[PDB]
Amino acid sequence: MRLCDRDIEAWLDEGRLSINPRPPVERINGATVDVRLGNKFRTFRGHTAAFIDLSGPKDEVSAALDRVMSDEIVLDEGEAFYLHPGELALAVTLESVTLPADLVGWLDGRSSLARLGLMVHVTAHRIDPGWSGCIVLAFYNSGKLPLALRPGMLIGALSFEPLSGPAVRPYNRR
Amino acid sequence: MRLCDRDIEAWLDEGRLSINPRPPVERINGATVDVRLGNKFRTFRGHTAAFIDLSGPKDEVSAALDRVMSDEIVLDEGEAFYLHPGELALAVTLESVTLPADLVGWLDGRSSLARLGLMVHVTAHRIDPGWSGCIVLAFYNSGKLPLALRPGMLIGALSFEPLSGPAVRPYNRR
Amino acid sequence: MRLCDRDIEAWLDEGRLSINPRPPVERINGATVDVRLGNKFRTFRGHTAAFIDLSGPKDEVSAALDRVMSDEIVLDEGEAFYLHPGELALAVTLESVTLPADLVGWLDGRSSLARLGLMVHVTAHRIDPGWSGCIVLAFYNSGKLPLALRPGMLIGALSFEPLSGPAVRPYNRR
Ligand SMILES: Cc1cn([C@H]2C[C@H](O)[C@@H](COP(=O)(O)OP(=O)(O)O)O2)c(=O)[nH]c1=O
Numbered sequence: 001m002r003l004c005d006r007d008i009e010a011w012l013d014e015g016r017l018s019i020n021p022r023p024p025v026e027r028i029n030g031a032t033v034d035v036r037l038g039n040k041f042r043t044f045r046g047h048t049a050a051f052i053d054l055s056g057p058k059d060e061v062s063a064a065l066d067r068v069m070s071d072e073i074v075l076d077e078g079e080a081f082y083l084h085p086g087e088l089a090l091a092v093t094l095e096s097v098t099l100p101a102d103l104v105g106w107l108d109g110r111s112s113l114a115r116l117g118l119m120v121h122v123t124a125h126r127i128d129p130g131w132s133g134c135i136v137l138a139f140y141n142s143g144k145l146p147l148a149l150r151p152g153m154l155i156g157a158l159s160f161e162p163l164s165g166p167a168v169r170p171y172n173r174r
Numbered sequence: 175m176r177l178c179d180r181d182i183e184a185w186l187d188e189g190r191l192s193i194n195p196r197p198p199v200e201r202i203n204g205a206t207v208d209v210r211l212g213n214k215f216r217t218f219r220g221h222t223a224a225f226i227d228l229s230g231p232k233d234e235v236s237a238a239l240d241r242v243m244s245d246e247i248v249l250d251e252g253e254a255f256y257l258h259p260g261e262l263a264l265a266v267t268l269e270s271v272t273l274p275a276d277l278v279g280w281l282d283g284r285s286s287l288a289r290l291g292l293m294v295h296v297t298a299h300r301i302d303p304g305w306s307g308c309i310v311l312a313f314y315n316s317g318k319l320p321l322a323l324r325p326g327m328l329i330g331a332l333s334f335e336p337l338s339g340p341a342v343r344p345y346n347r348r
Numbered sequence: 349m350r351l352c353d354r355d356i357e358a359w360l361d362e363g364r365l366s367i368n369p370r371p372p373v374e375r376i377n378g379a380t381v382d383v384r385l386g387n388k389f390r391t392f393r394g395h396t397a398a399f400i401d402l403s404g405p406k407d408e409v410s411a412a413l414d415r416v417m418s419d420e421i422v423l424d425e426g427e428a429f430y431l432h433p434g435e436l437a438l439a440v441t442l443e444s445v446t447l448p449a450d451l452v453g454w455l456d457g458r459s460s461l462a463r464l465g466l467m468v469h470v471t472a473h474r475i476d477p478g479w480s481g482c483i484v485l486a487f488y489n490s491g492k493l494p495l496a497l498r499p500g501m502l503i504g505a506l507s508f509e510p511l512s513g514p515a516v517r518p519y520n521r522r
């Protein structure tokens with residue numbers, strides 16, 4: 001059962017859930033905390049590789065994945081990242097997030113950006129008990145026009161669901 | 175923890191969750207209420223704009239978004255909407271939905287349409303405590319062939335999860 | 349509220365949730381059971397049909413869908429299935445899954461494959477109370493390069509949420 005907004009504020013106070021920087025009350029509502037776009041991106045350069053073998057020898061995998069991914073792109077103040085129709089790109093939330101062993105996060109993108117084509121990371125919704133860090137975001141433009149994305153914009157909504165008990169093998173321990 | 179079918183029927187009876195028109199027992203099963211496709215659509219006309227700036231000056235934004243979106247398309251009885259491969263379109267559920275401050279909805283599309291390419295709105299699953307209205311749907315054809323969509327068809331499944339208490343800032347109040 | 353890893357192990361022991369073959373402790377962590385890719389695939393052959401009418405006369409529907417879908421593709425040991433950019437394909441989990449009437453499953457794909465383009469089945473997350481069987485997976489490559497998928501690879505994560513009571517009309521009974 002999701003935490004309502006005021007229980008989120010509670011868990012943040014007790015020190016049992018951490019979100020950094022801490023979002024003000026404006027950005028905690030209903031059952032979600034709004035999260036923000038960070039300033040570190042990546043694109044793909046397919047030309048160096050014929051395919052990616054997901055389940056294969058971690059040698060060739062490491063090095064193939066090293067070829068295909070752009071170097072980190074960091075945008076100066078007031079600069080957009082243009083995500084063109086049909087492009088997949090990686091970015092990161094502005095906020096860091098630390099979950100205890102008895103809470104799981106679910107990240108949704110914003111419905112109003114998805115109406116213009118933005119699918120964020122959408123084969124995976126789940127932030128694990130124990131997770132501590134930024135969240136890697138995978139964007140895909142499924143609309144006709146390019147979409148300009150600026151660091152600081154609202155990019156998603158985080159909701160939190162207590163588990164039936166504290167996980168034995170959370171992220172930090174395993 | 176999701177409401178099972180018979181608790182959904184309960185909450186609808188107590189007057190604590192509203193779905194309009196009210197779906198019969200056929201369309202409430204397991205842990206979901208089947209929802210239906212409405213009769214109001216939109217497509218994109220990119221030609222008037224170079225991009226969309228999501229986080230930018232609400233003036234230019236309003237007017238850019240005014241250009242790019244088709245006018246409302248309403249289908250006469252017995253008429254299909256053809257969603258061609260690679261097209262993003264907006265539609266609406268037939269049913270209206272009103273949630274109390276201590277319940278959150280999650281909308282999934284139907285697995286059997288997704289097997290033919292239909293991604294519905296899938297960067298966002300969440301209907302907020304306090305939401306009252308139709309649900310805007312964003313479709314994308316990810317398959318090879320066009321898909322004919324007729325108002326009244328089953329288009330999704332709504333499930334409901336009580337919150338840990340009533341939200342302080344639900345949709346209606348904020 | 350999701351089952352943590354050790355409650356999943358409990359429900360599997362009590363005989364109240366079944367996953368076959370049973371995954372070892374390595375593959376149950378936090379709040380999910382890792383699931384594996386099976387060895388039965390399908391692709392599309394659009395050339396025989398102009399469109400698919402989802403909501404139409406189950407005669408023509410059966411036969412149209414019979415045309416468009418490839419025959420079952422079964423991969424010999426050590427063989428990949430190449431899913432090319434922009435292709436939608438169907439596969440199946442290696443594990444079978446049987447849920448009781450008071451538990452609902454949610455399947456997420458893996459975040460690390462989605463970073464390379466793999467959207468799995470993502471308009472639908474939900475395994476119903478009463479479901480018993482393999483899970484049909486719908487893949488879509490949203491990246492630049494083809495992705496090689498081998499039977500046995502990790503393909504997803506299953507999490508489980510008790511309902512507010514046992515469903516009256518679960519999958520097996522309705
Ligand atoms: C997921 C979804 C939500 N909504 C509704 C439910 C939410 O309560 C509300 C807002 O969802 P939200 O994801 O917060 O998007 P936004 O950027 O508009 O705030 O809109 C839809 O109309 N359609 C959808 O497909």
Ligand SMILES: Cc1cn([C@H]2C[C@H](O)[C@@H](COP(=O)(O)OP(=O)(O)O)O2)c(=O)[nH]c1=O
Nearest residue numbers: 284285286469472473474475476479483484
């Ligand atoms: C989400 C998902 C569900 N299922 C199963 C689980 C559900 O219990 C069942 C039905 O899901 P549902 O979304 O109701 O699709 P449909 O139009 O076939 O009724 O199929 C899959 O086989 N694969 C999937 O990827």
Ligand SMILES: Cc1cn([C@H]2C[C@H](O)[C@@H](COP(=O)(O)OP(=O)(O)O)O2)c(=O)[nH]c1=O
Nearest residue numbers: 121124125126127128131135136458459460
């Ligand atoms: C869904 C999501 C998860 N994560 C985090 C949360 C999870 O705790 C963790 C692992 O998610 P998981 O789906 O298990 O992917 P993987 O193949 O890497 O194990 O990564 C992200 O960084 N970004 C995301 O978009």
